[PDB]
Design a binder for this molecule. Structure first.
Ligand SMILES: [Ca+2]
Ligand SMILES: [Ca+2]
Length: 279
């Protein structure tokens, strides 16, 4: 399948080269997979989600996304226009308040929630969790992310936006999950992206158009935007039967575009998420 005039990041994930604008993907499109977006919530009523999104948990007075961040990330995973995996099921877990903040204790509870809640859902092709969040190093946050992964969920986490080594941030620094840096449309490391040996992969993160609250759209930047490209890619590849939740990060690294990015510090992988879709 071909989506013309796609957001640059979608086109990038299905291309060996920068500078194109059509997204190519197998029409299965992540059908039968599930992606949990652990964030500020998801505006499930947005036409872009087509009834495929729902809120399943909140730790606050409402499950509504009063911020937009979670809606944007969910859109990159699975919206019809802005998403990688256009037929996946999206589940919102609101661990971040409407200012975009959340206590680590709440974030940990949300990860444990997903590990259990997947057993309440129909995800025959597998389960992914996208975590566009983090703060300073915490062994307890990392352990929660490790448990979620161990339980059979493909965990994708943002590297962080500090232009620093991700070893000092969580859950970015948990080795067993998929830690995602950000690139731009010219194949440069995004100016803010964290780096380091713990990164597994890069995805598009500068100037990413997606859904927003109030039934709207906007372009924003961050490792938060790169992460859902990888989460959606994992769901897509799992639906195709090419990989599993436990092995998808490694498979994505195996099949990535190699050596295409500039300003990658010595010791950081030069790997850009790629669907290898061949019609
Ligand atoms: Ca290339
Ligand atoms: Ca890893």
């Amino acid at each position: 399948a071909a989506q013309t005039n796609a957001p640059w990041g979608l086109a990038r994930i299905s291309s060996t080269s920068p500078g194109t604008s059509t997204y190519y993907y197998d029409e299965s499109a992540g059908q039968g997979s599930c992606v949990y977006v652990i964030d500020t919530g998801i505006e499930a009523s947005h036409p872009e989600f087509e009834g495929r999104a729902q809120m399943v948990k909140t730790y606050y007075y409402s499950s509504r996304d009063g911020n937009g961040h979670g809606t944007h990330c969910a859109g990159t995973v699975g919206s019809r226009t802005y998403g990688v995996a256009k037929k996946t099921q999206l589940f919102g877990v609101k661990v971040l308040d409407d200012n975009g903040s959340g206590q680590y204790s709440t974030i940990i509870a949300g990860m444990d929630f997903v590990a259990s809640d997947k057993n309440n859902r129909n995800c025959p092709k597998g389960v992914v969790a996208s975590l566009s969040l983090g703060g300073g190093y915490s062994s307890s946050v990392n352990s929660a992310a490790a448990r979620l992964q161990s339980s059979g969920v493909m965990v994708a986490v943002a590297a962080g936006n500090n232009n620093a080594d991700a070893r000092n941030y969580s859950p970015a620094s948990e080795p067993s999950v998929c830690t995602v840096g950000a690139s731009d449309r010219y194949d440069r490391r995004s100016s803010f992206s964290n780096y380091g040996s713990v990164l597994d992969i890069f995805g598009p993160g500068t100037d990413i158009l997606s859904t927003w609250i109030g039934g709207s759209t906007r372009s924003i930047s961050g490792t938060s935007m790169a992460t859902p490209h990888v989460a959606g890619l994992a769901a897509y590849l799992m639906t195709l039967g090419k990989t599993t939740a436990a092995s998808a990060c490694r498979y994505i690294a195996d099949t990535a575009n190699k050596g295409d990015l500039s300003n990658i510090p010595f010791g950081t992988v030069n790997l850009l998420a790629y669907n290898n879709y061949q019609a």
